[PDB]
């Protein structure tokens, strides 16, 4: 998906049992309702959906609006796009999300968002964290969200600052039971 009615036509002639589709979102700047509804209605072709965010500027607040129809979703990647708190609440709102990646968050992580309602993604297994602006107490309540989900298998906490003595709460949250 660069920068599209032909692919809308392509999936919208026959529909069969696709297993998984991978969506490469590249640099979404223009945003009209026709592409919102068409590219929204494409995403029900497979049984699982792998959404990839790649530097999309028009999706800074239109996460839940476009994906409201998109009930089918399996994993998601965040590559260098702005994001709001309520959109993170939409990320934690869905339960079929099993694997999640996030990269290059310059802004401070607001409370009441992803790290604060973390314990709802009850099938989380692979979680990727990079370049997140937080503080110690945000890492503490983050680790409180880590105490909830007990099906994780893979964790990335790369390139993190302002996390002095939060690792006692994080590692304390991880080393509880034989996970």
């Amino acid at each position: 998906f660069y920068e599209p009615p032909r692919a809308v036509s392509l999936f919208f002639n026959w529909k069969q049992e696709f297993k998984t589709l991978e969506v490469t979102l590249r640099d979404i700047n223009k945003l009209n309702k026709q592409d919102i509804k068409y590219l929204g209605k494409i995403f029900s072709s497979a049984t699982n959906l792998r959404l990839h965010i790649k530097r999309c500027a028009a999706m800074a607040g239109r996460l839940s609006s476009v994906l409201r129809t998109c009930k089918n979703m399996h994993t998601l990647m965040v590559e260098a796009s702005p994001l709001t708190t309520d959109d993170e609440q939409y990320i934690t709102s869905v339960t079929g999300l099993q694997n999640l990646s996030i990269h290059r968050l310059h802004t401070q992580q607001l409370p009441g968002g992803l790290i604060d309602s973390l314990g709802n993604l009850k099938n989380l297994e692979r979680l990727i964290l990079d370049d997140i602006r937080m503080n110690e107490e945000d890492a503490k309540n983050l680790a409180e969200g880590l105490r909830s989900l007990k099906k994780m298998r893979l964790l990335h906490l790369t390139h993190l600052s302002d996390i002095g003595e939060g690792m006692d709460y994080i590692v304390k949250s991880l080393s509880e039971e034989s996970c």
């Binding site: 809308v8 036509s9 919208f12 529909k15 209605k41 494409i42 029900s44 129809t69």
Partner: protein, 203 residues
């Protein structure tokens, strides 16, 4: 010797349906029933449930055309319960029942426990079943095999593309599609141009 009784757009009362449900036991061969396109003011729930409780006595009734009245989806599980008592039906028309997901999944457990595929025409008018109940309604309609002529028209509803694609898969899947009526709908270019087959569409 009456075998077809057809009344539409007529000022029926709860007294008419009442005495019909008081002396209907004498009539035996009346196998085809149309009382649809009408309205019951009061006790349409009560005279309806007493009426279908009389209809359990019958053993030939294959055509049922039912009107719209007030507080009806409590009479839906007793209608469908007497049709759990009734292993035979061929013509079903249901006008303006305003049903929801719970009633269409009650019908789901009905058709998934009682296989009834002698049915040929079906009306489901004016109901506000949500889109996921339309999808599960394509699971229930996916269970069916022998529906011929039908009408799933309702209020001005925007369908989802999952409903459209299950409609193309199952409507393309079934064989006896003669005429299909959906009025009050939005199918613009791709959805309207992605269905067409052996049926006859009515907007």
């Amino acid at each position: 010797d009456l075998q077809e009784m057809k009344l539409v757009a007529c000022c029926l009362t709860a007294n008419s349906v009442k005495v019909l449900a008081q002396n209907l036991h004498n009539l035996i061969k009346l196998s085809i029933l149309d009382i649809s396109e009408n309205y019951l003011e009061k006790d349409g729930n009560e005279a309806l449930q007493e009426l279908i409780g009389r209809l359990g006595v019958l053993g030939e009734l294959t055509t049922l055309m039912l009107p719209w009245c007030w507080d009806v989806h409590t009479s839906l599980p007793k209608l469908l319960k007497q049709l759990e008592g009734t292993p035979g039906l061929a013509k079903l028309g249901l006008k303006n029942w305003r049903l929801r997901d719970e009633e269409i999944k009650s019908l789901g457990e009905f058709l998934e426990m009682n296989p009834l595929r002698d049915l040929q025409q079906l009306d489901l008018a004016g109901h506000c079943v949500s889109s996921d109940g339309w999808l599960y309604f394509m699971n229930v309609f996916e269970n069916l095999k022998q529906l011929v002529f039908f009408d799933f028209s309702t209020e001005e509803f925007l369908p989802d593309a999952a409903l459209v694609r299950k409609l193309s898969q199952v409507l393309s899947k079934l064989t006896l599609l003669q005429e299909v009526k959906l009025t009050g709908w939005e199918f613009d270019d791709y959805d309207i141009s992605a269905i067409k087959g052996t049926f006859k569409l009515v907007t």
